[PDB]
Design a protein around this ligand. Structure first.
Ligand SMILES: *C(=O)[C@H](Cc1ccccc1)NC(C)=O
Ligand SMILES: [Mg+2]
Ligand SMILES: [Mg+2]
Ligand SMILES: [Mg+2]
Ligand SMILES: [Mg+2]
Ligand SMILES: [Mg+2]
Ligand SMILES: [Mg+2]
Ligand SMILES: [Mg+2]
Ligand SMILES: [Mg+2]
Ligand SMILES: [Mg+2]
Ligand SMILES: [Mg+2]
Ligand SMILES: [Mg+2]
Ligand SMILES: [Mg+2]
Ligand SMILES: [Mg+2]
Ligand SMILES: [Mg+2]
Ligand SMILES: [Mg+2]
Ligand SMILES: [Mg+2]
Ligand SMILES: [Mg+2]
Ligand SMILES: [Mg+2]
Ligand SMILES: [Mg+2]
Ligand SMILES: [Mg+2]
Ligand SMILES: [Mg+2]
Ligand SMILES: [Mg+2]
Ligand SMILES: [Mg+2]
Ligand SMILES: [Mg+2]
Ligand SMILES: [Mg+2]
Ligand SMILES: [Mg+2]
Ligand SMILES: [Mg+2]
Ligand SMILES: [Mg+2]
Ligand SMILES: [Mg+2]
Ligand SMILES: [Mg+2]
Ligand SMILES: [Mg+2]
Ligand SMILES: [Mg+2]
Ligand SMILES: [Mg+2]
Ligand SMILES: [Mg+2]
Ligand SMILES: [Mg+2]
Ligand SMILES: [Mg+2]
Ligand SMILES: [Mg+2]
Ligand SMILES: [Mg+2]
Ligand SMILES: [Mg+2]
Ligand SMILES: [Mg+2]
Ligand SMILES: [Mg+2]
Ligand SMILES: [Mg+2]
Ligand SMILES: [Mg+2]
Ligand SMILES: [Mg+2]
Ligand SMILES: [Mg+2]
Ligand SMILES: [Mg+2]
Ligand SMILES: [Mg+2]
Ligand SMILES: [Mg+2]
Ligand SMILES: [Mg+2]
Ligand SMILES: [Mg+2]
Ligand SMILES: [Mg+2]
Ligand SMILES: [Mg+2]
Ligand SMILES: [Mg+2]
Ligand SMILES: [Mg+2]
Ligand SMILES: [Mg+2]
Ligand SMILES: [Mg+2]
Ligand SMILES: [Mg+2]
Ligand SMILES: [Mg+2]
Ligand SMILES: [Mg+2]
Ligand SMILES: [Mg+2]
Ligand SMILES: [Mg+2]
Ligand SMILES: [Mg+2]
Ligand SMILES: [Mg+2]
Ligand SMILES: [Mg+2]
Ligand SMILES: [Mg+2]
Ligand SMILES: [Mg+2]
Ligand SMILES: [Mg+2]
Ligand SMILES: [Mg+2]
Ligand SMILES: [Mg+2]
Ligand SMILES: [Mg+2]
Ligand SMILES: [Mg+2]
Ligand SMILES: [Mg+2]
Ligand SMILES: [Mg+2]
Ligand SMILES: [Mg+2]
Ligand SMILES: [Mg+2]
Ligand SMILES: [Mg+2]
Ligand SMILES: [Mg+2]
Ligand SMILES: [Mg+2]
Ligand SMILES: [Mg+2]
Ligand SMILES: [Mg+2]
Ligand SMILES: [Mg+2]
Ligand SMILES: [Mg+2]
Ligand SMILES: [Mg+2]
Ligand SMILES: [Mg+2]
Ligand SMILES: [Mg+2]
Ligand SMILES: [Mg+2]
Ligand SMILES: [Mg+2]
Ligand SMILES: [Mg+2]
Ligand SMILES: [Mg+2]
Ligand SMILES: [Mg+2]
Ligand SMILES: [Mg+2]
Ligand SMILES: [Mg+2]
Ligand SMILES: [Mg+2]
Ligand SMILES: [Mg+2]
Ligand SMILES: [Mg+2]
Ligand SMILES: [Mg+2]
Ligand SMILES: [Mg+2]
Ligand SMILES: [Mg+2]
Ligand SMILES: [Mg+2]
Ligand SMILES: [Mg+2]
Ligand SMILES: [Mg+2]
Ligand SMILES: [Mg+2]
Ligand SMILES: [Mg+2]
Ligand SMILES: [Mg+2]
Ligand SMILES: [Mg+2]
Ligand SMILES: [Mg+2]
Ligand SMILES: [Mg+2]
Ligand SMILES: [Mg+2]
Ligand SMILES: [Mg+2]
Ligand SMILES: [Mg+2]
Ligand SMILES: [Mg+2]
Ligand SMILES: [Mg+2]
Ligand SMILES: [Mg+2]
Ligand SMILES: [Mg+2]
Ligand SMILES: [Mg+2]
Ligand SMILES: [Mg+2]
Ligand SMILES: [Mg+2]
Ligand SMILES: [Mg+2]
Ligand SMILES: [Mg+2]
Ligand SMILES: [Mg+2]
Ligand SMILES: [Mg+2]
Ligand SMILES: [Mg+2]
Ligand SMILES: [Mg+2]
Ligand SMILES: [Mg+2]
Ligand SMILES: [Mg+2]
Ligand SMILES: [Mg+2]
Ligand SMILES: [Mg+2]
Ligand SMILES: [Mg+2]
Ligand SMILES: [Mg+2]
Ligand SMILES: [Mg+2]
Ligand SMILES: [Mg+2]
Ligand SMILES: [Mg+2]
Ligand SMILES: [Mg+2]
Lengths: 136, 49, 386
RNA sequence: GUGAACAGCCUCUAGUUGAUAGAAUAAUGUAGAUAAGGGAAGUCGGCAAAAUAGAUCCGUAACUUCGGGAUAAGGAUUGGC
RNA sequence: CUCUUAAGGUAGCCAAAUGCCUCGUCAUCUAAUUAGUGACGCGCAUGAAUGGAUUAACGAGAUUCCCACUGUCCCUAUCUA
RNA sequence: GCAGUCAAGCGUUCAUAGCGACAUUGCUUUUUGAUUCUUCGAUGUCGGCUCUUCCUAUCAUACCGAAGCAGAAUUCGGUAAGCGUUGGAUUGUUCACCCACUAAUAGGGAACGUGAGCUGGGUUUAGACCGUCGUGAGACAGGUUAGUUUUACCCUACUGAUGAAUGUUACCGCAAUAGUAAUUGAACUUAGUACGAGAGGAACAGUUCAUUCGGAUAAUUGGUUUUUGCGGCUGUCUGAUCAGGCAUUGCCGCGAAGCUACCAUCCGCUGGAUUAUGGCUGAACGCCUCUAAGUCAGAAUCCAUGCUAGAACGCGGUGAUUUC
């Protein structure tokens, strides 16, 4: 998370290290996002900074609009597809990896999200749940 | 305490066990164990098992 | 030259040496503080670990995100037979530590601890405590002489007890003897409280209670002579390394011309007397009570024993402490449950939790049914039972 | 016999059943493997390993000495009666 | 314009395997590149059978990137001889 | 390379908040030289991976002291090595330069730590190419390409393992001593409050979690399959069927038990004595002063609480103690 996130997030299973190519599910024009950094990672030797649902990552657009390529931008993960664990006992995971484009302040760049977003991201970022469809 | 039904077979999923799976068009499936989650990914017909 | 990238050291130096202990019963290194105003009671207890299960309960934590919402936790079921008092041990404070000078036994001991004192019960003449029973044959001048010294000296008093192993489904049939220090006030009434309890059992209805952070002392499950990568957590060597990749590289510098005691070396992993603290008791059940697994939300008649019993253990026909989290030690092993060493107040202690659903599905495979009456109702009739 | 085949695998005719053995299954090895999520971020370097693989049909670029590139690339089908 | 040689590097090509200064300058590839490629060049010491320049096809040759793929790595774990 | 001394000046005014010329005294030796003392009947010489330990000239964290410190931020200094210091593109590189995370991403030593630990990419061979130089053979801190990494079973050290002898044997203990670990951040609230003309913008207490490390553990989830447990399939073999053999565990799906994973879960305690510093009373010095005698509050410090071993020559209690 970092600065600008409302509330804390319980730790779930990390599934997205640096170098992962997720999808981009909105009307911003970007097709995929390439993870180069994770906000709030550890400084331990020989650990790739891994991400999860609701984490704020730095992404680079590889496929999509040419205006969005060759630049660094923040991103918020909305689908993880790694089997994490909630406290009530369910082991749930999405089908693919996905994220949205965002500013360093936390506001959304797009207007809609064409896929499902889990409640660990919809309760941590209020602007994602305002443009999402069905939760979980 | 709420017991959900299995999406593939139809058994009783108890709180604590079971693996949930959500499809890309946001349809929620609830599997009992690593058996029905494996046979779902192989495109098996539950009316033939 | 220095390290190119500095990393935290693998392992914990305060747990060296990692050699094997004395016995499989982990002794108690420290007992809680004696209070002069509290009534006389036990401060530790010995049980047998038997299986684990997953329990749905309500989180009574205001300010969190899952307040008043169901959470699941993994608990352990330690077995609790009735435990009987057979001995009283005193200790006088010396300038070289403590020193036992009088240990008073009981008169008619059971055959469990008599089997403990011999290595060959089938060749022995069973003549233990036969000349000690001549002390109880007189009027009792020599009996009260040993206890009057405990009424005068021996400021701290420990009590020899043992678990009734014949009410336990283990295949050992030999009781474990241990000392329990008593932290009740008026030290003259310590030996006067255990004199009445000779050949009298002690339950856990007064020792432990509901919603209590307790300690746990046991011996780690052994794993034999384990390699250095899995023992210490060392980063593995690459694939191209000659004569070993699952090892540790160079030990140290030239000077000092020795191997240091803090490097990762291969050896024994397991069979370690550990002490895990701050575990919360969720349920203390009775042995004679039907439906020990019955919950006020559930209201059904089912016990805590799973379908087919516990894995490698059997069935619980006695008392049990249902404590939070993983307890050290494996199945079928003696484990000493200890009272807390301090008054814990940290917003996770003193929490009046209440269980909602107690699982009793089979742990031998994939648990699909809780009770066998539920299995007969869902599956229906079969080829058999006709 | 399967198969394009003196490939691999399996049996008949013919020769062997010889290579110190027994009891246990610790570490570390040699050899053969499998791993959720990510996909080289490891490393001097995709080293090693994995993936593609036969046949039939469709389709096949820049360039060129017009011979090639070419099995280019990229898709589909395959069993029993 | 001047000095001087027998003649004074022509057609091409180039930080190329040949460029010390250089990790040259610019553009592209990348979030980031002393690498790769495309150009400029008064080029310590490029150059015409000392063979120059360009080349289809070919290569257990040297190097760079992308797709597919994989414990190589995050991060280790297990089984067998 | 680092730290001083003096104070001409800078700092709107003011030498010493922060700096500081001209001079000058030293320390370190992680630079490069100087020397040739040791080694040429051989110390395996670069770099990285991996691993432990130590030093402080302290980057961050704990507590404080000064400011041209209003708040926020920043700068200087003290006690302090307890603890933390990275993911990457390129380069064989140490070094260097960017991207980016982070509380911060510091400098080092240990035969320029470490090749019977590894890699061998570079250079330090024999093949070959180009440039320059030489008539030539050939040379080149000029460039490029391909080029065997040997042995521990000895002693010690260390990680573990027993074990004779203290009348024998059995059980329950005491504890010398040795090791010792937890670290750090964000959010909610305090609070848009203190402060400020505004812009801007905290802190203690309380609560929810997270970073890294450590010890456990298999309920569940995920992995592993020689349970060759069951089912399915191909080739061939036993006349067919049934049931099987073989294909160095044949292949595929599922798979408990066991092992195992921040790809799983649980847990990580409390007092006392201090340093820096801020004070009390109080002289030296009728006054003044943290001090000279006394004394108070005080750091991630130290010692204990606790935790891990139990001196195999440290110790105590108790049970039994043989008849050809
Ligand atoms: C230069 O120092 C080396 C030394 C050397 C001698 C023998 C074997 C290996 C290295 N010599 C060269 C020519 O490189
Ligand atoms: Mg939360
Ligand atoms: Mg899209
Ligand atoms: Mg590394
Ligand atoms: Mg499984
Ligand atoms: Mg260092
Ligand atoms: Mg590194
Ligand atoms: Mg103690
Ligand atoms: Mg004690
Ligand atoms: Mg006595
Ligand atoms: Mg025996
Ligand atoms: Mg049995
Ligand atoms: Mg074993
Ligand atoms: Mg093993
Ligand atoms: Mg572990
Ligand atoms: Mg090798
Ligand atoms: Mg290692
Ligand atoms: Mg050692
Ligand atoms: Mg089980
Ligand atoms: Mg043949
Ligand atoms: Mg063969
Ligand atoms: Mg032989
Ligand atoms: Mg053998
Ligand atoms: Mg092995
Ligand atoms: Mg994998
Ligand atoms: Mg998964
Ligand atoms: Mg996968
Ligand atoms: Mg991929
Ligand atoms: Mg790389
Ligand atoms: Mg790539
Ligand atoms: Mg190379
Ligand atoms: Mg490299
Ligand atoms: Mg490189
Ligand atoms: Mg190479
Ligand atoms: Mg490649
Ligand atoms: Mg290699
Ligand atoms: Mg290869
Ligand atoms: Mg595979
Ligand atoms: Mg294809
Ligand atoms: Mg081609
Ligand atoms: Mg057909
Ligand atoms: Mg010219
Ligand atoms: Mg000419
Ligand atoms: Mg011409
Ligand atoms: Mg040139
Ligand atoms: Mg070049
Ligand atoms: Mg540069
Ligand atoms: Mg461009
Ligand atoms: Mg590259
Ligand atoms: Mg370049
Ligand atoms: Mg070029
Ligand atoms: Mg020049
Ligand atoms: Mg030439
Ligand atoms: Mg000519
Ligand atoms: Mg080639
Ligand atoms: Mg050839
Ligand atoms: Mg084996
Ligand atoms: Mg220095
Ligand atoms: Mg002035
Ligand atoms: Mg002034
Ligand atoms: Mg001065
Ligand atoms: Mg001076
Ligand atoms: Mg000076
Ligand atoms: Mg000197
Ligand atoms: Mg230096
Ligand atoms: Mg000199
Ligand atoms: Mg010399
Ligand atoms: Mg040498
Ligand atoms: Mg040597
Ligand atoms: Mg040599
Ligand atoms: Mg030698
Ligand atoms: Mg002033
Ligand atoms: Mg100010
Ligand atoms: Mg500010
Ligand atoms: Mg020190
Ligand atoms: Mg240290
Ligand atoms: Mg730290
Ligand atoms: Mg770096
Ligand atoms: Mg690297
Ligand atoms: Mg590199
Ligand atoms: Mg910074
Ligand atoms: Mg040397
Ligand atoms: Mg040196
Ligand atoms: Mg060296
Ligand atoms: Mg060596
Ligand atoms: Mg060597
Ligand atoms: Mg070499
Ligand atoms: Mg080489
Ligand atoms: Mg030589
Ligand atoms: Mg050569
Ligand atoms: Mg040369
Ligand atoms: Mg070059
Ligand atoms: Mg070379
Ligand atoms: Mg070769
Ligand atoms: Mg060896
Ligand atoms: Mg030898
Ligand atoms: Mg040796
Ligand atoms: Mg030894
Ligand atoms: Mg004798
Ligand atoms: Mg606010
Ligand atoms: Mg102002
Ligand atoms: Mg534990
Ligand atoms: Mg599986
Ligand atoms: Mg299998
Ligand atoms: Mg079969
Ligand atoms: Mg099949
Ligand atoms: Mg057949
Ligand atoms: Mg038939
Ligand atoms: Mg045969
Ligand atoms: Mg095989
Ligand atoms: Mg399993
Ligand atoms: Mg195993
Ligand atoms: Mg966890
Ligand atoms: Mg952990
Ligand atoms: Mg915790
Ligand atoms: Mg305590
Ligand atoms: Mg003290
Ligand atoms: Mg005091
Ligand atoms: Mg101070
Ligand atoms: Mg005063
Ligand atoms: Mg005076
Ligand atoms: Mg003072
Ligand atoms: Mg004083
Ligand atoms: Mg004085
Ligand atoms: Mg005072
Ligand atoms: Mg501490
Ligand atoms: Mg202790
Ligand atoms: Mg502790
Ligand atoms: Mg001893
Ligand atoms: Mg001694
Ligand atoms: Mg010894
Ligand atoms: Mg002693
Ligand atoms: Mg004795
Ligand atoms: Mg003794």
């Amino acid at each position: 998370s970092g600065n600008g996130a409302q509330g804390t997030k319980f730790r779930i299973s990390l599934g997205l290290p640096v170098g992962a190519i997720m999808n981009c599910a909105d009307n911003s024009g970007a097709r995929n996002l390439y993870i180069i950094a994770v906000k709030g990672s550890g400084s331990r030797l020989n650990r790739l900074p891994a991400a999860s649902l609701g984490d704020m990552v730095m992404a680079t657009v590889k496929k999509g609009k040419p205006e969005l390529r060759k630049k660094v931008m923040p991103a918020i993960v909305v689908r993880q597809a790694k089997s994490w664990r909630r406290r009530d006992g369910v082991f749930l995971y999405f089908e693919d990896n996905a994220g949205v484009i965002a500013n360093p302040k936390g506001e959304m760049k797009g207007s809609a999200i064409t896929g499902p977003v889990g409640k660990e991201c919809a309760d941590l970022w209020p602007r994602v749940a305002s443009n999402s469809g069905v939760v979980v | 305490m709420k017991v959900e039904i299995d999406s593939f077979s139809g058994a009783k999923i108890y709180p604590g066990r079971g693996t949930l799976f959500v499809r890309g068009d946001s349809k929620i499936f609830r599997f009992q164990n690593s058996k029905s989650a494996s046979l779902f990914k192989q495109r098996k017909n539950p009316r033939r098992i | 030259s220095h390290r190119k990238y500095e990393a935290p050291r693998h392992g914990h130096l305060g747990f060296l040496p990692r050699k094997r202990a004395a016995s499989i019963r982990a002794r108690v290194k420290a007992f809680p503080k004696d209070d002069r105003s509290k009534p006389v009671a036990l401060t530790s207890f010995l049980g047998y670990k038997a299986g684990m299960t997953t329990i749905v309960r309500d989180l009574d934590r205001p300010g969190s995100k899952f307040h008043k919402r169901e959470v699941v936790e993994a608990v352990t079921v330690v077995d609790t037979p009735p435990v009987v008092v057979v001995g009283v041990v005193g200790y006088v404070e010396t300038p070289r530590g403590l020193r036992s000078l009088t240990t008073v036994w009981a008169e008619h001991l059971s055959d469990e601890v008599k089997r403990r004192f011999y290595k060959n019960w089938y060749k022995s003449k069973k003549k233990a405590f036969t000349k000690y029973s001549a002390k109880y044959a007189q009027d009792g001048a020599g009996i009260e002489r040993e206890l009057a010294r405990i009424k005068k000296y021996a400021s701290v008093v420990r009590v020899l007890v043992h678990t009734q192993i014949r009410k336990t489904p283990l295949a050992q049939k030999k009781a474990h003897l241990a000392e329990i220090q008593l932290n009740g006030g008026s030290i003259s009434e310590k030996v006067d409280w255990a004199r009445e309890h000779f050949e009298k059992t002690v339950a856990v209805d007064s020792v432990f209670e509901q919603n209590e952070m307790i300690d746990a002392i046991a011996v780690t499950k052994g794993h034999g002579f384990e390699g250095v990568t899995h023992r210490w957590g060392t980063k593995k060597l690459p694939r191209k390394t000659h004569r070993g990749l699952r090892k540790v590289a160079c030990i140290g510098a030239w000077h000092p011309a020795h191997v240091m005691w803090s490097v990762a070396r291969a050896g024994q992993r397991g069979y370690h007397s550990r002490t895990s603290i701050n575990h919360k008791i969720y349920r203390v059940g009775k042995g004679d009570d039907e439906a020990n697994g019955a919950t006020s939300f559930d209201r059904t008649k089912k016990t805590i024993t799973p379908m087919g019993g516990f894995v490698h253990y059997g069935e619980i026909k006695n008392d049990f402490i249902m404590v939070k989290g993983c307890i050290p030690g494996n199945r079928k092993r003696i484990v000493t449950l200890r009272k807390s060493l301090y008054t814990n107040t940290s917003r996770k202690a003193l929490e009046e939790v209440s269980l909602k659903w107690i699982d009793t599905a089979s742990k031998f495979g994939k648990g699909r049914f809780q009770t066998p009456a539920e299995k007969h109702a869902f599956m229906g009739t079969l080829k058999k039972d006709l």
